[PDB]
Enzyme design. Structure first.
Site, PDB file in Angstrom:
ATOM      1  N   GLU A  86      -1.819   5.762  -8.784  1.00  0.00           N
ATOM      2  CA  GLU A  86      -1.215   5.816  -7.426  1.00  0.00           C
ATOM      3  C   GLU A  86      -0.110   4.764  -7.242  1.00  0.00           C
ATOM      4  O   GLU A  86      -0.119   3.751  -7.952  1.00  0.00           O
ATOM      5  CB  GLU A  86      -2.284   5.612  -6.353  1.00  0.00           C
ATOM      6  CG  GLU A  86      -3.315   6.718  -6.288  1.00  0.00           C
ATOM      7  CD  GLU A  86      -3.869   6.907  -4.887  1.00  0.00           C
ATOM      8  OE1 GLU A  86      -3.105   6.684  -3.913  1.00  0.00           O
ATOM      9  OE2 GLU A  86      -5.052   7.262  -4.772  1.00  0.00           O
ATOM     10  N   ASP A 140      -1.309   1.660   3.150  1.00  0.00           N
ATOM     11  CA  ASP A 140      -0.238   2.137   2.233  1.00  0.00           C
ATOM     12  C   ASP A 140       1.130   1.732   2.784  1.00  0.00           C
ATOM     13  O   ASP A 140       1.837   2.616   3.312  1.00  0.00           O
ATOM     14  CB  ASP A 140      -0.320   3.652   2.044  1.00  0.00           C
ATOM     15  CG  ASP A 140      -1.332   4.075   0.996  1.00  0.00           C
ATOM     16  OD1 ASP A 140      -2.428   3.476   0.957  1.00  0.00           O
ATOM     17  OD2 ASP A 140      -1.010   4.994   0.216  1.00  0.00           O
TER      18      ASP A 140
END
Ligand SMILES: OC[C@H]1O[C@@](CO)(OC[C@@]2(O[C@H]3O[C@H](CO)[C@@H](O)[C@H](O)[C@H]3O)O[C@H](CO)[C@@H](O)[C@@H]2O)[C@@H](O)[C@@H]1O
Length: 406
Positions: free
Chosen positions: A260, A39
């Site tokens: 997301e 991420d």
């Protein structure tokens, strides 16, 4: 009347030669062997271009110790920064924050180097600091008032940092933990964005839109549990720490729970909205893979329509279906580049749940924890096509020429 990613769209989802990335093979040596990183986001200027401080780019990753089981890294995620002079050979800058950070642990966000030289590192505060047992409460926070100093040897980010929560769900436009039916609610992944047309300052995030019990908003009550949405907040002042919640840009009601790491790439007149989603977060009766999904409109708050008809922009091959995730798209000349991280590989045929079965050594053996080879894609209206790849986690500037395509 919020734009909707509909079940008629998701029904069309399907791997094609235009959406499937090549097999990712582990890179020959790691920048931080002791650390797993996922991420990742870029230090950007206000306009959105990759920021450059004395010839260095900076990026931020969620990190955990490599000796930790992959399934558990999310409980102890800490933000580290890395810096590079070329965009290929990254140096570990260490943790960004010394302390006073909000939440039990920090999840993904964005980074702004403002015109005034002040640094803002937006992040998700997961849980509450020093909590008894781990909780899944998410609030949009910022570490403000940082300084980025760069010599010819490297980049250090120096303190002090003013950590504060910016936004919590209102319970009317954005679902709170209490209202969560089915899976755990989302309110995370704050992405800073200045609209180059309006000049107005926004902050995108992943949320859910609350659906009352018996609302009938779907053709089956269980579908209503899948209430994923891309939320947005506005700063009237343009101060990066003063935000008011707006109506969501897009909802996946009856389709998906987790939209997301939402972000917008503006290309000529058009606003491309990108979200990474899982196969397991799709509502029943729908089948989509772990992938980057994408929508396009003529304005930031416009009537978004799904790219390639279904919304699927980019995905992993069927025979390595979890090899990458948490893709972030950014412009480079006439191309779009997409950087994910190297997720789970060499599962043979096992599902991700089944990876919790295996010995600790066999689990760490099937998790990358590095940047994936950055994908080159070509946009043409509401249609996309994979054109090729670059080296593992190459983040190039517009001032750099990329290798030719086949
Ligand atoms: O959770 C912290 C951080 O991770 C993000 C994006 O990676 O969520 C990841 C998520 O999925 C992880 O675990 C699943 C298996 O259940 C795996 O398939 C995937 O590759 C992993 O990323 O982990 C949490 C679990 O509660 C979920 O939020 C999400 O599905 C992101 O939300 C956040 O910044």
């Amino acid at each position: 009347a919020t734009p909707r990613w509909t079940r008629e769209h998701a029904s069309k989802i399907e791997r094609t030669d235009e959406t499937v990335v090549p097999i990712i093979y582990p890179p020959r040596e790691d920048a931080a062997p002791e650390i797993n990183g996922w991420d990742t986001w870029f230090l950007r200027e206000r306009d959105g271009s990759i920021a450059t401080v004395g010839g260095w780019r900076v990026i931020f990753s969620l990190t955990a110790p490599a000796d930790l089981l992959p399934g558990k890294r999310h409980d102890v995620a800490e933000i580290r920064y890395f810096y590079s002079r070329d965009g290929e050979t990254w140096f570990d800058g260490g943790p960004v924050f010394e302390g006073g950070t909000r939440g039990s642990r920090q999840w993904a966000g964005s980074a702004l180097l403002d015109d005034d030289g002040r640094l803002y590192v937006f992040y998700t505060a997961s849980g509450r600091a020093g909590e008894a047992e781990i909780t899944y409460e998410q609030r949009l926070a910022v570490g403000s008032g940082g300084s980025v100093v760069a010599d010819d040897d490297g980049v250090r980010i120096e303190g002090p940092f003013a950590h504060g929560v910016l936004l919590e769900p209102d319970g009317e436009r954005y679902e709170r933990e209490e209202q969560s039916r089915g899976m755990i609610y989302t309110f995370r992944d704050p992405w800073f964005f200045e609209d180059p047309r309006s000049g107005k300052t926004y902050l995108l995030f992943e949320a859910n839109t609350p659906i009352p019990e018996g609302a009938g908003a779907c053709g089956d009550p269980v579908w209503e549990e899948f209430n994923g949405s891309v939320g947005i907040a506005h700063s009237p002042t343009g101060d990066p720490t003063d935000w008011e919640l707006c109506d969501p840009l897009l909802e996946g009601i009856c389709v998906n729970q987790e939209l997301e790491r939402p972000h917008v790439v503006v290309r000529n007149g058009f606003y491309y909205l990108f979200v990474s989603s899982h196969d397991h977060t799709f509502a029943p009766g729908l089948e989509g893979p772990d992938g980057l999904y994408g929508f396009v409109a003529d304005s930031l708050r416009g009537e978004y329509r799904p790219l390639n008809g279904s919304g699927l922009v980019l995905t992993n091959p069927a025979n390595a279906p979890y090899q990458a995730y948490s893709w972030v798209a950014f412009s480079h000349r006439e191309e779009l580049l997409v950087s994910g991280f190297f997720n789970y590989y060499d599962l043979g045929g096992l599902t991700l749940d089944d990876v919790a079965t295996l010995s600790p050594d066999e689990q760490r053996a099937k998790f990358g924890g590095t940047l994936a080879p950055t994908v080159r894609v070509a946009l043409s209206g509401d249609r996309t096509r994979i054109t090729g790849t670059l080296s593992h986690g190459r983040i190039p500037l517009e001032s750099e020429e990329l290798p030719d395509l086949p």
